[PDB]
Amino acid sequence: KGETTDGVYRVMTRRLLGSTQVGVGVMQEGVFHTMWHVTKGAALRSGEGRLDPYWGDVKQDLVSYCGPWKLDAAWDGLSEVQLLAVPPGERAKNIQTLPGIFKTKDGDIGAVALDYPAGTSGSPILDKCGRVIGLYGNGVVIKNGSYVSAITQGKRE
C-alpha cells in the first residue's frame, strides 16, 4: 500500500516549513532500518501504507519498522567502505573512505570521518559486496570542529 522495494529512502516531515528531510534509512527484506533520533519511534507513511515501529533502542540509536533488524554484515577492520550519503534536496552519492576507530570501554567501533547535514542521519555504509555494515548519524565533533560518525550496526536474531 505501500513501497516495499529494497534500497535507500529519505525520511521527510511536513510538520515544519515546507517538506523537511529529518533523515535516511534502509529497506531490506520488508523491514525499514533508521536511527532512533530521526523518528523518535514515531510511525511512518509510505504512500497510503503505514509503517509501525517493531524494535528500537535509544542507546544503540537504532529502530526497525515492520519487523526485526535484518542487517548483520560487519566492517572487516581493514578495507575501505562507501557511505551512500543521501543529503537533503541532493541526489544519493557514494563516497569511499577508510574508517577510523572509536575506542570504548566496551570495545572498538568503525568510524567514518565525513561531514554532512544532520538530515543525512541514517545513510548506509557498504562493504565491497554492497552489504550494509551500518548506518551513519551517531558520533562526535572533534577539536577541528568536523564530524566523525560511528559505523552503527544492530543485531539480527
Ligand X SMILES: O=C(Nc1cnn2c1CNCC2)c1cccc2ncccc12
Pick one of 31, 66, 86, 151: the residue that binds another protein (CB under 8 A). Answer: 86
State the binding partner of 116 from ligand X, another protein, none, CB within 5 to 8 A by kind: ligand X
In this structure, the chain runs to a length of 157
Contacts of ligand X in 83-102 (CB under 6 A): none
Q: How distant, in Å, are the alpha carbons of 14, 34, 89, 92, 127 from that of 19?
A: 5, 19, 10, 18, 32
Q: Which is nearer to another protein, 129 or 157 (CB)?
A: 129
Please count the other Cβ atoms lying within 10 Å of the Cβ belonging to residue 118.
13
Please state whether beta strands 31-34 and 49-51 pair in parallel, antiparallel, or not at all (unpaired).
Answer: unpaired
Q: Is 31 in the site for another protein (CB under 8 A)?
A: no
Query: Catalytic: which of 6, 19, 33, 37?
Result: 37
Residue 127 catalytic? no
Residue 146 catalytic? no
Residue 61 catalytic? yes
Q: For residue 97, give the C-alpha cell.
A: 573512505
